[PDB]
Ligand binder design. Sequence first.
Ligand SMILES: [Mg+2]
Lengths: 94, 93
Amino acid sequence: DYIPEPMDLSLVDLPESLIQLSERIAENVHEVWAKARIDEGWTYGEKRDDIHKKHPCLVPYDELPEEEKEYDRNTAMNTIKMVKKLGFRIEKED
Amino acid sequence: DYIPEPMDLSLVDLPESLIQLSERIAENVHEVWAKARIDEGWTYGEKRDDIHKKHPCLVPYDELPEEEKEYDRNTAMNTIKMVKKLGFRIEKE
Ligand SMILES: [Mg+2]
């Protein structure tokens, strides 16, 4: 009975100067995720494993497989697009 | 050898009107995640299971346990704070 129905942000316009920073943003978010997991005793492991608290994405961001990095940049951008869709201006300062 | 060191955003100031919308944002972000998973064959299961592609968070956002929603909202706000920290202004139109 559950069907995800995310909002259509395909036409939201973000500043190019911000999209260029996608990678910074995804990186910080990954760092926060990994500090949280690591604080709860998680460590790096080749195979994901709930019992030994093993996760393969517990590596520096640069070392993530490219599709995981795509995922993270895209997530970052969805979130920000959602903020622009809810009626906020986003502009680079001077 | 790997130590995560996220940036300190504790002192970044967001409009209150935006923080009030945390739940809308986190929800939509949950929908995007759940649609991607479900498209790759994942379904709801009370225990997480990579073989049968089972995940207990594949439920409507409202049904998520409160600590999971907490996590989702905080993540949403981290991301937006990081934009403000990188030199962008964010203001209600
Ligand atoms: Mg598992």
